[PDB]
Design a protein around this ligand. Structure first.
Ligand SMILES: Cc1c[nH]c(=O)[nH]c1=O
Ligand SMILES: Cc1c[nH]c(=O)[nH]c1=O
Ligand code: SF4
Lengths: 1011, 1011
């Protein structure tokens, strides 16, 4: 037969494989109109019908992210200096840092940074109106692809931390409880268990106060996060999670107790010995209108304070003891108002069975208070909008509402608003929900706050800097003060008050506090993990250090790196005066190793830099100064001489005398098998011998990867007396040419260049091979790793490969010295998680991937699965039909009485130290002959995760075994039995873990070419 | 002094540098509220107040892209199989292919693909309602980051092509015009010079028809693209560009005669000897309403058909000889309707000076059918929206409209719309514009179409597949047929018609046409460029070939690659029967070299694959069949033996006898400072080449490994042994990474074992490029076949410039499919063609010089706007808007300047370089470090108008450089100071291409010695 020709059944497999076209394509406009419907993904502008949402409380947030989407967006963030997003965040979250942590896969460190400044970090990630806050200042708004999804990233990192089930711990910088001064036992009262008081109590507990009580009127906690924000924006289990974190700090909550004249008052708190009080009761009553006087819910009238708590109580499992039904909202619903509550009333009314929802407001579209995020949810769910209408009267017939009369409004010459009595609208309605806002009106509650001063907005008056009322022991914040318009601002109000409550209480006990307010961070048991390591008789407080490179150009830079937390640092390589050099410019350029992607996260750099231009006297004086000031931080002096015994001996002794803990020998010098000393084992052995005879401190040989066998050079260094090797220096390369042939870097008028050194993540596979091969050949010989280390996650790969410490250059060039805090918290988390048996199915900090579309979990419904319903076109309609019917079956098949007491996971094995993980990977490395060819695998695709791109199919067709069927109608792939398990399809799929490799169960025959 | 500390002025420079935080930050809610306005980038929700737009016709499209943004978005596209976006494009554009070309920087190839199926490809890129077309089907809608900006990408590639100023050429597949059959001289008439006729005439001219005339009623051409679509969405020079492309094919346009009685009729056309006619006159008249009878423009009334051409004539330079005054539209403007025209009237009215615009429509918001893109523009410019109002009276006093009276509208149960006479609105207004649609209604125009059949909507009937009317020689398309609602569907109507006009005319002359419609592609002189090359006596039709790898697993795949256009291919390496191998699985994994980015454009792969599992008998028979079927495509047999003379001679003779054009010796076989493999030892390579040279007479090439100290010594030994060239290079040995539990990937068997693998792809391109350059400089003229990260025409040309003659590809096909060859070939043709064009020297290949821009739109060149430290946020942005608006007004009150350049194509001034002409031309720039000038230093300089204020340059200079950048605390604008050393890190990390540039240093230079 013709061996080079596909047989008919493979030709059939290949039907949808791309082919080069020779002509333009003929398709009529009518046929194109009909075919469009089959592939449609987004909403249809001609669709006017609301799709059925009765009893559907699934997440509708557009900002929710899964891990795949979160990694992409975190990598996109510029991680800006003095970032304007943080300036625009009311709690001043270090967004730069927590997004950096997410991009490095350090979800713990991200969450810790979030909760350090915002104890309701998950709630806020979900509900913050970011377009009017952090995102509104994001620099990437100045790009076509637009601003960063900061809230979704905050939500993702916080959701992972939640799933870790790690508790908050008492501030570890505090003295033991025993030894705390008496002032910290002062009895503190907080009124209302909403965002403001939860924040305030949390920060007070961080400061060490041990007697903190929140008194809550209702039987549920969380405030408006619980009672009014819909479950389809903020799941109730988020609120519970954040309350439990605060309770870890000892805060007490007592429900069923009210600030009111016949219960708790300021006077009764004083009588009972309370020393300070925080008022955080919000705005508990609806703003009402005479037009609705006497109307009952049974007639069809609600305020938002009546309606939204009913929906919350029904839809939020564990909010109440009583299971309760969803309000029977049938027919046409009129929502009055255009604030943000109005849009939650409209979307919630659809969940209660509304046939039609009209949002009617008394000003125009350009006057809507609502953030666009909030408006869009109502728009996409087909609520109707009626502007310029002021309500005049509700029509009641047969005991129920049947219509609302309105008068038109308009804006005149001044700008101020008139009503037009002659221009009426009679709007039919079965239900009316007023969303006019909220107030504090209850005279009993107001009198319980005697004698604090109220302002003309009729709210407690506070100093906006201290949150103190006119009574010095009473503070207030959140909605009740009338500035905060958001959860995060109410959180910040409690945070602000906490410092000044602390100051007031301390002064009452005769103690002063710092002139600069200084609140503690958020802490968990992860932060107590020991990440120190000893290597070559040297103690490293953590394994991360600055490589000898541009980040160590000046010793003042090393000083700042030590102040940031870096465990050790190399000097830039320096030499004797005779060997003075002069750099050229340009000399450091970005890598082209991952295409025309600019900005953060360059996959490599190339440099034609020389050794340090600063003198040996500068570096030796600097080493003395750094070791004087930072005795616990390791300083390694990097030195270079030509192939001359007397020179190496003189320079090494000079660096030793300066106080260096160790030396690093840079073997890049040309000599008299490559042109460099480091490429010849005999020269390396001699250089190490000369230094070993000259000094008594340890020294390490820095190996080049540009050699046939780096184990040869490493053994030469050991034979010469080196105490270890640094693996590796940069890979020799040329990073590319402009289209006119000239290079980059191009030096001088001649536009000349020379071969440079490639650094960064593009050389990590080369460095990782070098470290592992040296570690297997020379067991126990200390290795300092360098080559693309840019995270705790990747640092741990080099530790597992045999290195003891981790040098970094390019990751700092891509960012700044503060990445050390990400690396340290990330490594602590990785080691801590190894002790948690309940998380053993995770890959480091990553939860096992389950079925999702757009990071939202696929509903596991019998009638959604197995049956070839992709997420587009008519298949998507059928999917939505199936989900809707199952929500209705869910409305009766009704349960909410098996929640889950949230108890943290406890380590059930010792937490490994660094020395316990070094080299653990080497057991899996060997020769090719040690790999099983009997245990073969095949690919299997999770159809529910697939996004129908066909990349697996095209890679198997033109780089594989033509083993994947690609359906022409559903665009769903299926791996057939001809799969060889090569794993290319998995490697190109855009969805993490959509494709998995599983043990082959059918007989396996290698394809030998037989007909 | 303390050398390791920053002096005072450096400490202040470092003021905004990121530092690690040990405490939570205290910032009051009130202070946060006041600071938020300073940084604000996006629209303020509280802004009731549209900024001023009078006489401002600058681009407002949200989809416009510059090069930086286009490359990012094109790399994001999954480049899907059987792509649904193409299914959803009415002209069936190969979106996958043209976006692939953009990602590979081949803007010519992308434009050629666009214009092959859409002769108005630039217009459609700007105006297509993609959310209802191609983008509505995009698979990436199923990700959080969302669908691809297809239209903006189409616009960008077409804009670059426009700037190339290259003409369209006659279809080069046609015989010369002297020897075309008589039928192609048939006189063809088209009526109306809009998108439908322009498309129809273009495709007819592509087919070879030489007598094609478009008869246009007006003095201007382009149809609605000219007369009504606003300049701030579609610049007139786009329309002119596409018209001139069509005139390149010989289509004639005659303005001033109409299809109408007493003018042109179907009867006059027939009598004058026209053989076919296409009706593309659109809907030339406004849909009227009796309530507007007698109202005049002087009173303030317009239909859309009166208003929008008035604005076009004034704002589009080159439409008229008349410098037209913009309609003075002061006061309140009421636009009636909510179709897409209504929104263009609203935005255009602002440009005329309207103070407020109301969009008033008779149904609800759910019932608006305008695409969301178009609604968003009116919404963001603060137009008001009034639903459920039907106009009843226009009130005129003092000779001017002063108000419009409406009645409320309402739906029933039946869904039947009613008007409530008792519910009235009296809206004050100075101008009324009706946007009720367009119609064909002039009795003499319809009478000129006698006797074709019209339908119940008074439109000509066509067969929807052929576009033929009831008269066989008359065809129709576009708006006039009533099916197209878009420019692209109108283009498609003309495209569809062109084939059946062709079929009809050919039949009239007694000739048949193929049953499969075959419209020709779009061609330019670039497509005639020769990209063949000769090497080692072998003739390659193009320099691109498949490497010996997974894309050549089977000879059936090589066959399909040749059919796609690949110039050559390697077999997978094969061996004698006794050397049979068995692969393990998994064995090919994605690279980790550019972080957790999944899907397209993987920056590397790692493989632990062996040689072919298929027999030498399979491969030799396959080579015979491939060479019999594709004699002009080069087939190179890759072979491997152990270090054995008899084996190498036997296998190489077997492959030679099969008809292989050449052999490639895989030097990966183990044997025994010269490692394990034969390719790492020059003595072994020399002997192997000696053996093969004795055995065969065809050329052979030694495939070098990069895993060697000195690859030149290996290449020299191969040449001494008799090889005719070398292939540089094989994969780089590496370990791609470990999971957090220490297990490797790939992991084989239950033991999860691995071995060192080979790294391929763009991550190893700097290594391969250094290898090719160093061999080319040491062994000038010795043929080099390059392999290692070649993924585009421009990377291919880097390797040619470096001394290679042909270009092997693997990973780029694994990342995609075989059809990338068409991108590579057109891209290489374009790169060589542009080298002959003097007017484009300043480009870098296909990339224009970057002008100052924000979000890809050029910054206004205004004096008071330059150098005034006004970044694009907060109060500075408001000042920029004032300055821009002010001299839009000064450009108004002086109404001169109507000189739109007449478009002439650039002409090559020297011959087009052939492949052999460019080989090695980069080597002149390579040298030793000592040959680099250290006198000619550079410094960095920042273009503040392109800056997006991220501080990355600042952060990198601070912690990886010389603390030489000032970063302003209020404007977040950086300035390079005189302590710059030209190191070039800041440029290397800046997210904006060419925002930072290196320039010659003009101030005295001293190296920093620290001392
Ligand atoms: C001195 C030096 C400069 N650049 C590098 O990449 N490595 C080195 O050792
Ligand atoms: C046989 C072979 C497999 N994989 C590679 O990367 N190179 C080779 O030569
Ligand atoms: S022509 Fe229009 S519909 Fe087709 S791909 Fe381009 S933008 Fe999309």
């Amino acid at each position: 037969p013709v061996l080079s020709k596909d047989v008919a059944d493979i030709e059939s497999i290949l039907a949808l494989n791309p082919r080069t076209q020779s002509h333009a394509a003929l398709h009529s406009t009518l046929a194109k109109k009909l075919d469009k419907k089959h592939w449609k993904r987004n909403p249809d502008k001609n669709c006017f019908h609301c799709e059925k949402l009765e009893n559907n409380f699934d997440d509708i947030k557009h900002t929710t992210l899964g891990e795949r989407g979160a990694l992409r967006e975190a990598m996109r963030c510029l991680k800006c200096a003095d970032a304007p997003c943080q300036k625009s965040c009311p709690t001043h979250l270090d967004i730069k840092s927590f997004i950096t942590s997410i991009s490095n896969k350090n979800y713990y460190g991200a969450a810790k940074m979030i909760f350090s400044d915002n104890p309701l970090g998950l709630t806020c990630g979900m509900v913050c109106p970011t377009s009017d806050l952090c995102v509104g200042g994001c620099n990437l708004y100045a790009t076509e692809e637009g601003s960063i999804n900061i809230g979704g990233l905050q939500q993702f990192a916080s959701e992972v931390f939640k799933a870790m089930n790690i508790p908050q711990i008492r501030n570890p910088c505090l003295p033991s409880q025993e030894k705390m001064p008496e002032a910290y036992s002062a009895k503190i009262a907080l009124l209302g268990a909403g965002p403001a008081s939860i924040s305030c109590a949390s920060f007070l507990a961080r400061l060490g106060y041990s007697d903190i009580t929140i008194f809550e009127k209702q039987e549920y906690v969380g405030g408006l996060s619980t009672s009014e924000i819909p479950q389809f924006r903020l799941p109730y289990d988020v609120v519970n999670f954040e309350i439990e974190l605060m309770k870890d700090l000892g805060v007490k909550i007592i429900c069923g107790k009210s600030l009111s004249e016949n219960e708790i008052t300021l006077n009764t708190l004083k009588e009972e010995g309370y020393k300070a009080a925080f008022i955080g009761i919000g705005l508990p009553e609806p703003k009402t209108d005479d037009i609705f006087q006497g109307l009952t819910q049974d007639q069809g009238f609600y305020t938002s304070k009546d309606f939204l708590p009913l929906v919350a109580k029904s839809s939020k499992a564990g909010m109440c003891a009583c299971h309760s039904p969803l309000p029977s909202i049938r027919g046409a619903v009129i929502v009055l108002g255009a604030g943000d509550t109005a849009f939650d009333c409209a979307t919630s009314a659809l969940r209660c069975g509304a046939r039609r929802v009209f949002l009617v407001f008394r000003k125009g579209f350009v006057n809507i208070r609502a953030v666009p995020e909030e408006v869009e949810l109502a728009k996409e769910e087909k609520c109707e909008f009626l502007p310029f209408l002021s309500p005049r009267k509700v029509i009641v017939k047969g005991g129920r509402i049947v219509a609302v009369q309105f008068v038109r409004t308009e804006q005149d010459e001044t700008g101020k608003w008139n009503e037009d009595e002659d221009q009426i609208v009679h709007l039919k309605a079965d239900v009316v929900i007023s969303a006019f806002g909220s107030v504090l009106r209850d005279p009993k509650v107001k009198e319980a706050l005697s004698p604090i001063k109220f302002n003309r907005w009729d709210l407690p008056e506070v100093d906006p800097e201290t949150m103190q009322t006119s009574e010095p022991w009473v503070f207030a914040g959140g909605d009740i003060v009338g500035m905060a318009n958001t959860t995060v601002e109410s959180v910040n109000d409690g945070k602000q008050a906490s410092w000044y409550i602390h100051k007031y209480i301390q002064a009452q006990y005769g103690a002063s506090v710092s002139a600069k307010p200084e609140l503690p961070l958020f802490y968990t048991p992860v932060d107590l993990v020991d990440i120190s390591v000893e290597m070559a008789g040297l103690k490293f407080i953590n394994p991360f250090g600055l490589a000898s490179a541009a980040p160590t150009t000046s010793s003042s830079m090393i000083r700042r790196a030590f102040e940031a937390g870096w465990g050790f640092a190399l000097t830039k390589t320096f030499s004797l005066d005779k060997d003075i050099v002069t750099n050229v410019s340009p000399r450091i350029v970005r890598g082209t190793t991952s295409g025309p992607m600019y900005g953060p996260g360059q996959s490599s750099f190339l440099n034609i830099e020389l050794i340090s231009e600063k003198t040996a006297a500068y570096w030796c004086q600097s080493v003395t100064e750094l070791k004087a000031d930072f005795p616990d931080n390791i300083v390694i002096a990097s030195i270079m001489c030509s192939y001359n015994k007397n020179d190496w001996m003189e320079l090494s002794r000079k660096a030793e005398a300066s106080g260096a803990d160790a030396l690093e020998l840079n073997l890049s010098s040309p000599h008299g098998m490559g042109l460099a000393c480091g490429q010849d084992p005999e020269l390396v052995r001699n250089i190490c011998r000369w230094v070993r005879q000259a000094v008594q401190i340890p020294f390490f040989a820095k190996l080049t990867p540009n050699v046939t066998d780096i184990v040869s050079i490493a053994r030469a260094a050991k034979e010469g007396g080196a105490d270890g090797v640094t693996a590796t220096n940069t890979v020799s390369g040329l990073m590319g040419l402009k289209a006119d042939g000239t290079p980059w870097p191009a030096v001088g008028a001649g536009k000349r260049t020379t071969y440079g050194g490639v650094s960064g993540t593009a050389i990590r596979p080369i460095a990782l091979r070098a470290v592992t091969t040296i570690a297997r050949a020379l067991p126990g010989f200390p290795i300092l790793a360098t080559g693309g280390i840019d995270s705790a996650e990747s640092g741990l790969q080099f530790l597992h490969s045999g290195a003891s410490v981790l040098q970094v250059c390019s990751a700092v060039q891509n960012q700044d010295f503060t990445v050390i805090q990400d690396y340290c918290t990330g490594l602590k988390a990785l080691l801590y998680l190894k002790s948690i048996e309940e998380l053993q199915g995770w890959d480091g900090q990553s939860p096992g991937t389950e079925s999702h579309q757009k990071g939202k979990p696929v509903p596991r419904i019998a009638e959604l699965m197995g049956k070839k319903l992709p997420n587009f076109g008519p298949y998507l309609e059928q999917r939505k039909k199936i989900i809707a019917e199952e929500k209705m079956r869910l409305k009766e098949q009704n349960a909410a009485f098996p929640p889950l007491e949230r108890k943290p996971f406890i380590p059930k094995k010792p937490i490994p130290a660094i020395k316990d993980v070094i080299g653990k990977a080497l057991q899996y490395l060997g020769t090719f002959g040690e790999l099983s060819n009997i245990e073969q695998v095949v690919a299997v695709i999770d159809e529910e995760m697939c996004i129908n791109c066909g990349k697996c199919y095209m890679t198997c067709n033109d780089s594989g075994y033509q083993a994947i069927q690609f359906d022409p109608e559903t665009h769903l792939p299926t791996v057939t039995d001809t799969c060889t398990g090569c794993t290319l399809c998995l490697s190109v799929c855009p969805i993490i873990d959509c494709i998995r490799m599983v043990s082959r169960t059918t007989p396996y025959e290698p394809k030998r070419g037989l007909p």
